Structure formats: structure tokens, C-alpha cells
Amino acid sequence: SQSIVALLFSEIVQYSQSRVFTVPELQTRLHDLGQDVGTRIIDLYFVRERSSKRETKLTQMLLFVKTTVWKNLFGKEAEKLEHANDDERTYYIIEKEPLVNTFISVPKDKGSLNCANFTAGIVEAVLTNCGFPCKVTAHWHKGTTYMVKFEDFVIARDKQMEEK
Amino acid sequence: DNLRHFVQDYAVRALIPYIEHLVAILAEGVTAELQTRKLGDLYFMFGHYNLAFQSYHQAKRDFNADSAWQYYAGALEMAALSAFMLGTAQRKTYDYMEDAIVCYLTVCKLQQFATRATLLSMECLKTARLYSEVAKQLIRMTNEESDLRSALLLEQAAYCFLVTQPPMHRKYAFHIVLAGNRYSRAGQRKHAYRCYRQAYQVFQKREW
Amino acid sequence: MSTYYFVIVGQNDNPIYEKEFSTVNKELRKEDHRHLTQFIAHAALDLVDEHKWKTANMQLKSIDRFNQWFVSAFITASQIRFIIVHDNKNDEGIKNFFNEMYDTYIKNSMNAFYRINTPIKSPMFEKKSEIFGRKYLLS
């Protein structure tokens, strides 16, 4: 079902909300779960759904891994992608569909951040396992949005291989 | 004292005719396979960089069939040195130099002239940017060399490959562990310990 | 014959596992092979990282050829460094052999109990590897 996953994920959040004391470390725990997901999904989908061939270059892998992960997760690719000049490290990936709202969401007083961070955790896993260590923030701006802070050695590395 | 310097002055005044006689020998040389060789051995101390490149040029047309490419190696040593000294650092002369060093070791058994070429080719390619080039021919000199010498060339190859880029950041350490015992058998005890210490440093950096 | 050596390297450069099939003899020298090549997998890696930054090919068949030690690279999406090192060449075996390595690796990587860059002791994986070696390498 849709609703079985929503229920299992409510028990996710509740187990955290139990043996976790404050919200940001709860988001951290969600992020850990996301890393756990990515750690194996990325290696799965190298072959079956990613042309079986590796892709290394940044923006192509960003968009294509975005899409392939979303097709084999929900079958719905993220609606848009922004990469920001003002900070070349600052890219935003934004999807109007929150994974969270399979169960419609939490109290709007205590926890500013939600599953949005857990999806961001899966994102971080796949990026850093492709070769792209990054930190990702989930913001309630224009719906569920994300922002990625890549790795400095990585950012120099692709900035150099911007040419061949 | 002042009197010591007066003798100094007279000595350098007596050196003027000596270097002018060498200038006359240089003139006699600029006016065969051995003529080109001697010409090279000449501007080897006159600073003629254009004639040093012309020495290797004529030696390629003099030892084309002659198996005496040891004088061609000597002329190319001057050519590569004069190129990087002037700042031209010709990659052409650099590659030719290896053609008269490692590739000449396949032709004749003049490893003495081959190692002479590789030695200064390493320093000139280190000032350039191809430090991995020096390292690769120092590994192609390690297999021959001896024991202390082989370990010395392995230590040279170690830092050279690591200097250009990350490539060889723990295999350089792994091979100076073998070069460490090579030095211990005959390799300098100081060289042995310091290359072992170098290996341990990047071993801790890359513990896995 | 051909010598047989497989290695598994975590993202954090951790040597996860290594597998052998060569005719058993002078086990000390086979361990010398192991560390020789495990530390050869070091520059091989320092090399193949930029090599993979160049080409995102299926498999990097050759990275270095030590003139007696041969470096064949099949790097993964999770950047798991894989190398076969052998004194003899057998390309057709090695290509789809690294393929099937990758496959059974996916199979035993899915299990949630595994975490990134961790040795895997599953003797089931051992016999899967052995069957592959008897298929694609050994005779």
C-alpha cells in the first residue's frame, strides 16, 4: 500500500521521538536512516536502471541519479533543479512531493524539519558514494526543497575537468 | 691580505691567456663523428646553447649508423641542460635524451653514459613538470643498478612520482620499505632509516 | 598457468576482502604476493582515481602493468575499488568476471546488516566467488 508505508514511517518517526530527546538530533537520526538507504540503493541501480554504465561528471550524475532514484523509489522525478552561481557550491534540488506526506504531516509547532531531512540523507548517501561528499539541508521553501554543499576537493576537481 | 690579493689578481690575469687559448680552440673547432663530439665537449663550457642543440643534431646524423651513440648521449646531455638553463626546457630534447639513455641501453651496453644522461634528465624534468618521467626511468634503472645504487634510484623514483600528483602515495612508501632493506644490505644506513621513516609516515596517513 | 588475486577496497580505502585460487605452494610467497599487490593497489588506486575521473567506462581493464604484475580495475558506483592482479592476461575471463563479482556483491550488499566499507565473512559469498573463478578464471 501507500498507507502501509505511511504507517511504517510514522513508527519510524515515533521510535526516534521516543529514544531521541531533541528535534535536531532526531533529524540527524533520520539523516542516518537516509544514509542507510542510499548506501545500497546506489550500487543496485548502477546496473539495472542507469544504463549499466558508470557516470562520473557532476551535473549529469546529479540529474540522472535524481531521476533514476526517484523512478525506483516513487516513480516521480524531482520537479526542478537549481544550481546557483552566487555560490558555485550551492545547488538546490527541489521536489514538490514530500516523501513524508504519505502520512500527512507532523505538528507545526515543535519540529520545523521533517522527513525532508531523511530524504536528504538518502541524497547525501548516494552523492558521497558516487564520489561527491556533500551536506544537504531541507527547507520548507517552495515546498520540500533541498540544498547541497559538495566537497571542496570534489568542487576543485570538477572545476578543473570542466574542460577535457 | 692585500699582498695575497695582489697574487690573486696576477693569477686571474694569467688565467686570461688560458681562457683565450680555449677560445682559440673553440674557434678552431667551429672552423665528422669525432669533430662533432669534440665540438660538443667544447661549448660544454662556453654557453653556446644553440650550438649545443646543433651538436646533438649533427651527432644524430653522425651516429645514425655508428653504434657510438655514447657521444650522441653526451651532446644531448648538453642540449637538454642548455635548453632548461635558458628556460626553453624543450620537451623534444627531453624525449631525445631518453632515446639516448634508456633506449640506448637496449642498443649497446654503455650503461655508464645511460645513467649519466638519466641523472641530469631527472633534474631537468623535475624543474619542468614531468617528475613521474624521472621516476619511471629511475625504476627502469633500479632493475639493473646494483644494491645500494638500486635502492638509491628507488628512493629517487619514490619522491619524484609523489611530487607531481597523488599517484604513488603509499606504493612509493611500500617500495622504499624494500629499498630500506636494500640500503641495509648495502644501502646507506642513514638513507635506510630516513626512507623507512618516510614510509611509516604515509603508512599512518593511509593506515588501511 | 595464471596467478589469481582479487581485492575489495572500501570507499575509505579499506581493504574489505581478498580472494585467491592459485595452485598452493610457498604460502609465505603467496602472502608476499598479497601485500605486494595490496600495496600495489595503493598507487594503482592513486592512479585509477583520476583514471575514473577521466572515463566512466564499465570497467578499466588496465591501469598499470608492472611487466609482471597486471592491474585490472572495475570500479563501482559506490567507488568500491576492485582489482585483479595476475602474472598472466585473460581479458575475457576478467571482464565478465568482475561483472559477476559486482553482481554477487550487489546481492550481498543489499543486506541491511552490511554497512559501507565493511569486511563481509559470508562463506556463501566465498563459494559464489569460487564458482565464478572456476567459471571465468580457473580450469
Determine the residue among B132, B143, B170 to mutate to test chain C binding: the one whose Cβ has the most chain C Cβ atoms within 10 Å. B170
CA atoms lying within 13 Å on the CB side of residue C119: 10
Question: Residue B25 class from Cβ within 10 Å (0-12 exposed, 13-18 middle, 19+ buried)?
Answer: exposed
In chain C, residues with a C-beta closer than 8 Å to the C-beta of B203 are none
- Determine whether the interchain pair B166/C13 forms a contact, defined as Cβ–Cβ distance below 8 Å: no
The residues, any chain, with a CB within 8 Å of residue B139's CB and separated by 6 or more, are B153, B154, B157
Of residues A130, B200, B208, the one with CA closest to residue C13: B208
Give backbone dihedrals phi and psi of A137, rounded to 5 degrees, phi first. Answer: -115, 140
**Bridge partners, residue A145, by sequence:** A94, A139
In chain C, residues with a C-beta closer than 8 Å to the C-beta of B173 are 39, 42
CA distance A143 to A98: 8
- Determine whether the interchain pair B170/C39 forms a contact, defined as Cβ–Cβ distance below 8 Å: yes
CA distance C1 to C88: 8
Q: What is the Cα B39 distance to its own chain's centre?
A: 20
Q: Which three cell numbers stand for residue A63?
A: 540529474
Could you say which of B161, B174, B208 has the minimum Cβ distance to residue C12?
B208
C81-86/A80-83 β-pairing: unpaired
**Residue in chain C lying closest to B178 (CA):** C36
Could you say which of C35, C44, C46 has the minimum Cβ distance to residue B166?
C46
Geometric angle at alpha carbon B85, from B45 and B119, rounded to 5°:
85
As a whole number of Å, the end-to-end CA separation of chain B is 65
Give backbone dihedrals phi and psi of C57, rounded to 5 degrees, phi first. Answer: -65, 165
Touching, B vs A (3+ Cβ pairs under 8 A): no
User: What subunits touch chain A, counting only 3 or more CB pairs under 8 A?
Assistant: C
- Determine whether the interchain pair C46/B208 forms a contact, defined as Cβ–Cβ distance below 8 Å: no
CB proximity A52 to C under 8 Å: yes
Report the amino acid identity of residue C85. Answer: V
As a whole number of Å, the end-to-end CA separation of chain A is 48
CA distance C91 to C72: 9
Give backbone dihedrals phi and psi of C8, rounded to 5 degrees, phi first. Answer: -125, 125
Give the technique used to solve this structure. cryo-EM
**Residue in chain C lying closest to A48 (CA):** C103
CA distance B78 to B47: 10
Q: Are C91 and C61 in contact (CB under 8 A)?
A: yes
- Determine whether the interchain pair A43/C78 forms a contact, defined as Cβ–Cβ distance below 8 Å: yes
CA distance B38 to B60: 15
Tell me how long chain B is.
208
CA distance B114 to B14: 38
Q: Where are the domains of chain C?
A: 1-139
Geometric angle at alpha carbon B41, from B38 and B47, rounded to 5°:
130
The residues, any chain, with a CB within 8 Å of residue C116's CB and separated by 6 or more, are A39, A129, C10, C11, C78
Q: Are C84 and C5 in contact (CB under 8 A)?
A: yes
Alpha helices (H) in C56-122, listed in sequence order:
91-109
